[PDB]
Design an enzyme around this catalytic site. Structure first.
Site, PDB file in Angstrom:
ATOM      1  N   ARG A  54      31.383  48.430  34.695  1.00 15.19           N
ATOM      2  CA  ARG A  54      31.740  47.133  34.139  1.00 15.19           C
ATOM      3  C   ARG A  54      31.629  46.098  35.248  1.00 15.19           C
ATOM      4  NH1 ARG A  54      34.582  44.358  30.416  1.00 15.19           N
ATOM      5  NH2 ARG A  54      36.466  43.206  30.958  1.00 15.19           N
ATOM      6  N   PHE A  59      33.488  37.291  38.634  1.00 22.24           N
ATOM      7  CA  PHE A  59      34.839  37.804  38.518  1.00 22.24           C
ATOM      8  C   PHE A  59      35.002  39.102  39.313  1.00 22.24           C
ATOM      9  CE2 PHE A  59      37.879  39.789  35.080  1.00 22.24           C
ATOM     10  CZ  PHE A  59      38.977  39.651  35.919  1.00 22.24           C
ATOM     11  N   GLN A  62      33.587  46.734  38.645  1.00 23.79           N
ATOM     12  CA  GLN A  62      34.534  47.816  38.439  1.00 23.79           C
ATOM     13  C   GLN A  62      33.856  49.186  38.290  1.00 23.79           C
ATOM     14  OE1 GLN A  62      37.633  46.844  35.443  1.00 23.79           O
ATOM     15  NE2 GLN A  62      37.453  48.892  34.658  1.00 23.79           N
ATOM     16  N   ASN A 101      43.737  49.378  35.670  1.00 20.58           N
ATOM     17  CA  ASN A 101      44.738  50.189  34.987  1.00 20.58           C
ATOM     18  C   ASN A 101      44.756  49.878  33.501  1.00 20.58           C
ATOM     19  OD1 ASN A 101      46.664  47.934  34.427  1.00 20.58           O
ATOM     20  ND2 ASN A 101      47.175  47.971  36.601  1.00 20.58           N
ATOM     21  N   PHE A 112      38.398  47.880  41.168  1.00 17.75           N
ATOM     22  CA  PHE A 112      37.441  46.812  41.057  1.00 17.75           C
ATOM     23  C   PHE A 112      37.442  46.053  42.364  1.00 17.75           C
ATOM     24  CE2 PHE A 112      40.545  43.300  40.381  1.00 17.75           C
ATOM     25  CZ  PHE A 112      41.653  44.022  39.927  1.00 17.75           C
ATOM     26  N   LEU A 121      45.758  38.069  38.291  1.00 16.22           N
ATOM     27  CA  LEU A 121      45.988  39.502  38.302  1.00 16.22           C
ATOM     28  C   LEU A 121      47.132  39.921  39.208  1.00 16.22           C
ATOM     29  CD1 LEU A 121      42.227  40.610  38.403  1.00 16.22           C
ATOM     30  CD2 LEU A 121      43.768  40.577  36.407  1.00 16.22           C
ATOM     31  N   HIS A 125      48.010  44.241  39.088  1.00 16.98           N
ATOM     32  CA  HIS A 125      47.127  45.265  39.633  1.00 16.98           C
ATOM     33  C   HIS A 125      47.450  45.431  41.103  1.00 16.98           C
ATOM     34  CE1 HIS A 125      44.548  45.536  36.113  1.00 16.98           C
ATOM     35  NE2 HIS A 125      44.875  44.264  35.985  1.00 16.98           N
TER      36      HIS A 125
END
Length: 164
Positions: A54, A59, A62, A101, A112, A121, A125
């Site tokens: 991903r 951004f 991952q 997660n 990531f 975030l 995370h």
């Protein structure tokens, strides 16, 4: 000292380059050790050969799902999941390495790499490392991602292990 691990990245089998990471074992020891051990493959499983499933441009990139290769699997060296260790470190900019997660205390093996400051975030995370060299290789990987995270080429960790 704080350990350094590397990933050698390949795009559809073709070598792209190497990214190395400093892991903050001084601040997040349990989380950093899980990643270090999954990079050496020393417990008998780990990241070598797995893909980045991903990637969302601007951004983050991952990966870390070495069992189902699509974001639905992976496992830690401590069991299928482990707790959020602490949230001392923040997502301050490009290069930050953090745990992906599925909600509170569900850390496994997915991670990531931020390519932007992602303050929304923080506290959700666990941040545990940063790119030491090869940020330009993460920027190059980023070009194969898309708005929904699907990649146009297979991005793989051709090799990985410890440097320091």
């Amino acid at each position: 000292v704080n350990p350094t691990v590397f990933f050698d990245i390949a795009v559809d089998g073709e070598p792209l380059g190497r990214v190395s990471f400093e892991l903050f074992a001084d601040k997040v020891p349990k989380t950093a050790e899980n990643f270090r051990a999954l990079s050496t493959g020393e417990k008998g499983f780990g990241y070598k050969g797995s893909c980045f499933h991903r990637i969302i441009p601007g951004f983050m990139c991952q990966g870390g799902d070495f069992t189902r290769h699509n974001g639905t699997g992976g496992k830690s060296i401590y069991g299928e999941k482990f707790e959020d260790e602490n949230f001392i470190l923040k997502h301050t900019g490009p290069g930050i390495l953090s745990m992906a997660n599925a909600g509170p205390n569900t850390n496994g093996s997915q991670f990531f790499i931020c390519t932007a400051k992602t303050e929304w975030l923080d506290g959700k995370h666990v941040v545990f490392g940063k790119v030491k060299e090869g940020m330009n290789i993460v920027e190059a990987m980023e070009r194969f991602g898309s708005r929904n995270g699907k990649t146009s080429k297979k991005i793989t960790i051709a090799d990985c292990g410890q440097l320091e």
